[PDB]
Design goal:
This is Cathepsin K. It is a peripheral membrane protein. One of its GO terms (biological process) is collagen catabolic process. Helix content is 25%, strand content 17%. The protein has six helices and eight strands; from the N terminus they run βααααβαβαβββββ. The strands form two sheets. Strands 1, 3, 4, 5, 6 and 7 form a six-stranded mixed β-sheet that branches. The protein has a two-stranded antiparallel ribbon with strand order 2-8. The longest helix is centred in the N-terminal third of the chain and has 18 residues. The two termini are 27 Å apart. The structure holds ligand 750.
Length: 215
């Protein structure tokens, strides 16, 4: 078995979503990490509610942005997270309207990838499934990506600003990569995804704030 894997084939990832006019990339990165663990722990693939995290994770800033841990931690002490269907996405901070009857998953903590260790992140993705990662996506070469293994020597590992989802890793034209799932719609990048340089010195700081939830 070639040392590369795409959890999309395994059935661990749901369709690509679009956050609309909202800075909720942290909420989708989290959800997809949970969506992945849920399918591992129970064999079911469901769409979890990111609106849930936007409206209720007060450790974050709604559409103003946020981090994934604070999200996983909320699910923990909340004893659950609704599903997309129970808590639909409207693309705008509203009042928390969490419904326990909607609860479609939960988690007993999370684990961080050691900072800047692509080896670690590789193992994780391999042994756990979709991992949540943060990156530098402010560059225009990113925003207009469409094919091949991305890499811009102007990416700044210290300027993380986007929460995306590692869902695999492989090799294209001999170029090691990271299958990344974005939340800007299916018409962005390549059907919503984007291959990002792997082992090229932690490009855009891919493994600089990596994490996944414990279920
Ligand atoms: C993400 O959404 C990433 N960003 C975007 O994606 C912008 C965008 C939006 C819509 C469409 C498109 C697009 C682009 C190209 C083609 C098509 N469409 C793009 C940019 C910014 C917004 C958001 N970023 C984040 O959330 C970061 C992520 C992190 C680096 C992983 N985080 C933050 O911005 C952030 C985290 C915060 C914060 C403010 C306060 C915080 O602490 C609160 C602490 N306190 C609260 C009370 O309770 C106790 C704790 C944390 O900002």
């Amino acid at each position: 078995a070639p040392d590369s894997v795409d959890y999309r084939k395994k059935g661990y990832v749901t369709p690509v979503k679009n956050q609309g006019q909202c800075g909720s990339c942290w909420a989708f990165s989290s959800v997809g990490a949970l969506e992945g663990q849920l399918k591992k722990k129970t064999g079911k693939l469901l769409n979890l509610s990111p609106q849930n995290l936007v409206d209720c994770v007060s450790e974050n800033d709604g559409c103003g942005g946020g981090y994934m841990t604070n999200a996983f931690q909320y699910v923990q002490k909340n004893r659950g997270i609704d599903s997309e269907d129970a808590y639909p996405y409207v693309g705008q901070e509203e009042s928390c309207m969490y419904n326990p009857t909607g609860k479609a998953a939960k988690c007993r903590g999370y684990r961080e990838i050691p900072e800047g260790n692509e080896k670690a992140l590789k193992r994780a993705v391999a042994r756990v499934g979709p991992v949540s990662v943060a990156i530098d996506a402010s560059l225009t070469s990113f925003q207009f990506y469409s094919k091949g293994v991305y890499y811009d020597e102007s990416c700044n590992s210290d300027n993380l600003n986007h929460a995306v989802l590692a869902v695999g890793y492989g090799i294209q034209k001999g170029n090691k990569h990271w299958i990344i799932k974005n939340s800007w719609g299916e018409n962005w990048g390549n059907k919503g995804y984007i291959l990002m340089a792997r082992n090229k010195n932690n490009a855009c700081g891919i493994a600089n704030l990596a994490s996944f939830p414990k279920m």
